[PDB]
Amino acid sequence: IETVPVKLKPGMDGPKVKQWPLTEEKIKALVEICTEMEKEGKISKIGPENPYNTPVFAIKKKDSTKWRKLVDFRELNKRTQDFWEVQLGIPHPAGLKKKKSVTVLDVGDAYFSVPLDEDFRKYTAFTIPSINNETPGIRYQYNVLPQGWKGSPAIFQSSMTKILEPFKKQNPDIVIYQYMDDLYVGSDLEIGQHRTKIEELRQHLLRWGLFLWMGYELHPDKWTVQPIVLPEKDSWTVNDIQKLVGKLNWASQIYPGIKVRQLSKLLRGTKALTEVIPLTEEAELELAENREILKEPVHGVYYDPSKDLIAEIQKQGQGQWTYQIYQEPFKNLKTGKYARMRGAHTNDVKQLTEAVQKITTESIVIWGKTPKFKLPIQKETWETWWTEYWQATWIPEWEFVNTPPLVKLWYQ
Amino acid sequence: MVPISPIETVPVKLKPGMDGPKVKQWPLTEEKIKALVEICTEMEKEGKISKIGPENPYNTPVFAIKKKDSTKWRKLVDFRELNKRTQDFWEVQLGIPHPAGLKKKKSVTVLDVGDAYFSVPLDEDFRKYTAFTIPSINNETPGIRYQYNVLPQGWKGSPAIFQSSMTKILEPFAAQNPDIVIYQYMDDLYVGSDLEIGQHRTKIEELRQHLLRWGLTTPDKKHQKEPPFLWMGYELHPDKWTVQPIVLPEKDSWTVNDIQKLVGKLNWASQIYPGIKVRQLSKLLRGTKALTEVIPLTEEAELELAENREILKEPVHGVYYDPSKDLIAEIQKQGQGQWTYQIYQEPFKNLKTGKYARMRGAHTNDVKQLTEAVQKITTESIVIWGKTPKFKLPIQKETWETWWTEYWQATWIPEWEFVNTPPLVKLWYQLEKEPIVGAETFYVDGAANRETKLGKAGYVTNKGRQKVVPLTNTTNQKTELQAIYLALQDSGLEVNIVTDSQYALGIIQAQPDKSESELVNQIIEQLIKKEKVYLAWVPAHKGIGGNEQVDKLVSA
Ligand SMILES: Cc1cc(/C=C/C#N)cc(C)c1Nc1ccnc(Nc2ccc(C#N)cc2)n1
Ligand SMILES: Cn1ncc(C(=O)O)c1-c1ccccc1
Numbered sequence: 001i002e003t004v005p006v007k008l009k010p011g012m013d014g015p016k017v018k019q020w021p022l023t024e025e026k027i028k029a030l031v032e033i034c035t036e037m038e039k040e041g042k043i044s045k046i047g048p049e050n051p052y053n054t055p056v057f058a059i060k061k062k063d064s065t066k067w068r069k070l071v072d073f074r075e076l077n078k079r080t081q082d083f084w085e086v087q088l089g090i091p092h093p094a095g096l097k098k099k100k101s102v103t104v105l106d107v108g109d110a111y112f113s114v115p116l117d118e119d120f121r122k123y124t125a126f127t128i129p130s131i132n133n134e135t136p137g138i139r140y141q142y143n144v145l146p147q148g149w150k151g152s153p154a155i156f157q158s159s160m161t162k163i164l165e166p167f168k169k170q171n172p173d174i175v176i177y178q179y180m181d182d183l184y185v186g187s188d189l190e191i192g193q194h195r196t197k198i199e200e201l202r203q204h205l206l207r208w209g210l211f212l213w214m215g216y217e218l219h220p221d222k223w224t225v226q227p228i229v230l231p232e233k234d235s236w237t238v239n240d241i242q243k244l245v246g247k248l249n250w251a252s253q254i255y256p257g258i259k260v261r262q263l264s265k266l267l268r269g270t271k272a273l274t275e276v277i278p279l280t281e282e283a284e285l286e287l288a289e290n291r292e293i294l295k296e297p298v299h300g301v302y303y304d305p306s307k308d309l310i311a312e313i314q315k316q317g318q319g320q321w322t323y324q325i326y327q328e329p330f331k332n333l334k335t336g337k338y339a340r341m342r343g344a345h346t347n348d349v350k351q352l353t354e355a356v357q358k359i360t361t362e363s364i365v366i367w368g369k370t371p372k373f374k375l376p377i378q379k380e381t382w383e384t385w386w387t388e389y390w391q392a393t394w395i396p397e398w399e400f401v402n403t404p405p406l407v408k409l410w411y412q
Numbered sequence: 413m414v415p416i417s418p419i420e421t422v423p424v425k426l427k428p429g430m431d432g433p434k435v436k437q438w439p440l441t442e443e444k445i446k447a448l449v450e451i452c453t454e455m456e457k458e459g460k461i462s463k464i465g466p467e468n469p470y471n472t473p474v475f476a477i478k479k480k481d482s483t484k485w486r487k488l489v490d491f492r493e494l495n496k497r498t499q500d501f502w503e504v505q506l507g508i509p510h511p512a513g514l515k516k517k518k519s520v521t522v523l524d525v526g527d528a529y530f531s532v533p534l535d536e537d538f539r540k541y542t543a544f545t546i547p548s549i550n551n552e553t554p555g556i557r558y559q560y561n562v563l564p565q566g567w568k569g570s571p572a573i574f575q576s577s578m579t580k581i582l583e584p585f586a587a588q589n590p591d592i593v594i595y596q597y598m599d600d601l602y603v604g605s606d607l608e609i610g611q612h613r614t615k616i617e618e619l620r621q622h623l624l625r626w627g628l629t630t631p632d633k634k635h636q637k638e639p640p641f642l643w644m645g646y647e648l649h650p651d652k653w654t655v656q657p658i659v660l661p662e663k664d665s666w667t668v669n670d671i672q673k674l675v676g677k678l679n680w681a682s683q684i685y686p687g688i689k690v691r692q693l694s695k696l697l698r699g700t701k702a703l704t705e706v707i708p709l710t711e712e713a714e715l716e717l718a719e720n721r722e723i724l725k726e727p728v729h730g731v732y733y734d735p736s737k738d739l740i741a742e743i744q745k746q747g748q749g750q751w752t753y754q755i756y757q758e759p760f761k762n763l764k765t766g767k768y769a770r771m772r773g774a775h776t777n778d779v780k781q782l783t784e785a786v787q788k789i790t791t792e793s794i795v796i797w798g799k800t801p802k803f804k805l806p807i808q809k810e811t812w813e814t815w816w817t818e819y820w821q822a823t824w825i826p827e828w829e830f831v832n833t834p835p836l837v838k839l840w841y842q843l844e845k846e847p848i849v850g851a852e853t854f855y856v857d858g859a860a861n862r863e864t865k866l867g868k869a870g871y872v873t874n875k876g877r878q879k880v881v882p883l884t885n886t887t888n889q890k891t892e893l894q895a896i897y898l899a900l901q902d903s904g905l906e907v908n909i910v911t912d913s914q915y916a917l918g919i920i921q922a923q924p925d926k927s928e929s930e931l932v933n934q935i936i937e938q939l940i941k942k943e944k945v946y947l948a949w950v951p952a953h954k955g956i957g958g959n960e961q962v963d964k965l966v967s968a
């Protein structure tokens with residue numbers, strides 16, 4: 001109550017981001033949601049003297065049949081001041097990624113209890129469009145802390161702390177971490193015990209002043225990585241050896257002492273691709289020395305919180321996807337592979353959208369921020385479809401890869 | 413007096429750091445001054461403007477213009493400077509409705525709300541910035557100073573503020589009468605419905621009564637404007653729509669300007685006339701940008717033009733949208749990167765048509781283009797109808813399955829069915845996933861001197877077949893493709909090719925079926941003739957025999 005003053009960064013105006021086309025079902029859902037929000041005082045109609053805009057759409061979270069309003073505050077978040085006044089900063093918990101279970105709660109509804117600074121409200125303008133632009137878009141702004149806005153967890157932080165105080169004091173080994181509208185709650189308890197503690201936690205929030213009932217369950221201690229591994233074969237074709245030398249050459253950019261001199265010598269002459277070549281002893285030794293190097297961690301790898309995280313994804317076929325997260329080239333902080341399913345067996349773009357979400361979740365758990373994605377998809381295809389499969393309350397940044405990377409081969 | 417509800421003002425500001433305009437009023441002729449004094453006296457009596465004291469330091473120039481063929485004068489206040497200094501507003505007029513998204517109506521009535529426009533009040537604190545000055549006769553007295561009390565014509569905020577004010581007034585009427593539609597365009601309201609005609613006119617009278625509560629009077633006479641409406645380049649009829657007449661001029665010679673106008677008309681026409689093409693005519697606008705320059709029409713452009721004339725020989729109309737039926741979109745390939753489409757609900761009754769053109773780029777293929785066209789039509793359809801149409805596409809289901817499963821990128825097209833209408837989109841080649849037993853293995857390479865542009869390209873094979881060709885006006889990257897071409901040319905129906913060219917791999921892994929590069933085209937033609945091709949990459953300079961042998965041959 002009684003607002004925290006907020007400003008944009010110096011020398012920049014509010015967001016003027018175009019509203020993208022929405023389907024009839026999403027428009028109807030948003031009309032219904034906003035009519036209720038307006039009745040509850042959360043939002044108010046605005047006039048033409050407000051020229052700002054931020055896009056809005058609607059999603060359905062995992063295992064739910066009701067729409068959730070999702071505002072894309074990516075632009076406003078860049079333009080909003082960083083918050084160092086009330087707090088100096090909140091160091092990210094390295095222990096979160098070590099818990100046997102981490103459950104993710106939507107706590108965004110709590111934010112609606114805090115009024116938004118009157119001078120800042122205009123920058124939260126959004127529009128519910130009409131089909132075929134037949135009626136003027138419905139224009140609103142927020143009166144309270146909006147879900148999805150950078151400033152909300154920052155401004156609500158003192159309120160949240162009081163709410164969770166008796167739960168933290170009573171359960172001192174449970175790790176609680178907040179990112180945007182998400183609360184991440186990790187414990188090493190048996191799944192049933194863990195589940196009751198989550199419901200325990202929920203009741204604290206329910207006790208106070210009021211998609212909270214939902215629970216997205218993670219198990220970061222079981223998360224796996226992808227070291228570089230080489231084939232073990234009894235017979236190598238010329239082709240197999242070419243593939244091996246190529247993979248090793250690529251690996252030598254990551255690992256210093258990798259050698260291919262002896263293996264390259266094996267194919268001496270100009271042989272049929274399918275001809276079997278016996279490994280010499282020298283070549284066998286070299287291969288063995290290479291295997292041993294590849295079992296060690298990469299040298300000079302460190303996280304810098306002042307640098308962006310970058311995430312690259314490759315399509316491997318048959319619903320398999322590989323990815324790497326890094327800050328500097330060849331210095332991977334995290335690699336991985338989803339061989340999984342869900343839905344999307346006949347839908348590449350749904351699969352990719354799920355991959356982006358899971359990777360972003362991993363990123364938040366490990367470093368407490370989202371990575372910038374390099375997506376293997378044409379811009380127009382992605383932009384047309386991603387919102388149909390999105391189920392998270394945050395949205396990362398992305399760019400598009402138009403040239404096929406040769407390195408897909410080596411993460412396979 | 414019958415009390416009327418005031419229209420709430422919209423608060424207005426200048427841009428940060430800016431002050432109001434202070435622009436000199438230049439002299440007017442004695443005749444213009446008397447005319448302006450008379451005009452402003454009437455406006456002042458109607459409350460639109462007010463005389464102000466000498467304290468106000470702002471000014472905007474005023475002019476008097478002869479309409480034409482009359483003795484009458486009109487006032488023009490030139491707000492260009494104040495507009496530069498006025499804040500931006502939310503503009504609703506962006507995104508006009510497409511006729512194809514409209515619903516058929518039995519009746520559409522027009523109501524004149526001209527009295528409303530010049531009567532919306534201006535933010536009190538902003539009025540001072542609208543000050544103007546009628547110069548005095550002979551400049552022997554102070555000029556008469558006025559400011560606006562209402563939205564001035566020509567001021568930056570007038571359209572947005574008038575639209576928002578009118579919408580707010582209409583909102584309750586629209587909400588409580590879901591059986592009509594109301595649309596505001598300039599000076600008029602348009603009201604449509606499917607009501608029994610007596611009920612329709614009742615609704616119109618009810619609207620007039622509603623508007624009266626704000627003092628907005630509408631003329632007793634029933635509007636002269638009636639269907640068809642000429643609107644934004646369209647003709648709207650009660651139950652169909654079209655573009656206004658498209659007439660292609662006859663000319664013995666054409667200039668840059670003429671062609672740009674030709675293409676504009678064709679583009680406008682293509683939203684309802686199926687099959688319109690503009691590729692060849694657009695090609696003539698390549699570079700240029702010198703307006704009066706005459707360009708000879710290529711035979712290709714002439715054919716394209718003639719094909720368009722035929723399409724435009726007689727009027728075609730679209731039907732309106734029936735929300736109770738599926739939307740269907742059908743696409744045809746036309747050639748040279750051009751695609752055309754129709755969107756309908758009942759067979760043979762298009763809501764609209766349209767076209768899509770291949771994006772610029774060195775290499776491309778039909779499947780990528782069809783995919784892009786699908787995304788474009790999908791996005792257009794969300795805008796117009798709020799939903800994706802079901803697609804009818806000239807590509808076999810098996811062809812699509814092979815494409816998307818093997819393509820290096822994620823890709824998707826929404827619900828669709830094959831339509832067997834030539835030309836069909838197909839895959840012209842697919843590379844092997846494994847090396848081919850029994851197929852000759854060609855190790856290829858090329859190299860070029862970057863100064864002289866002399867190079868060599870060639871191959872050596874496991875059967876001892878070899879070739880090196882000396883080349884002029886080439887580059888390393890080009891020699892790498894040249895070598896691959898030679899291996900394709902000289903091999904049998906199944907072939908393994910080993911290259912170290914990351915460049916060549918990047919192009920071939922993109923699966924082009926057509927290219928601006930004659931050499932890439934020739935490579936594609938060779939691939940099309942093979943039964944099996946496996947393309948293997950190796951790192952350069954690594955002692956990889958075959959590869960090193962040929963690298964040495966082609967070096968020097
Ligand atoms: C956009 C629009 C322009 C004009 C008019 C602009 C002008 N001048 C008139 C109206 C009423 C509308 N609004 C809507 C909304 C939904 N369906 C329709 N259908 C519809 C409109 C006109 C005719 C006719 N004749 C037939 C059907 N119109
Ligand atoms: C077959 N083809 N088509 C175009 C070219 C070229 O060099 O531009 C070639 C070519 C010329 C010499 C060697 C290899 C390809």
Ligand SMILES: [Mg+2]
Pocket residue numbers: 857858859912952963
């Ligand atoms: Mg070479």
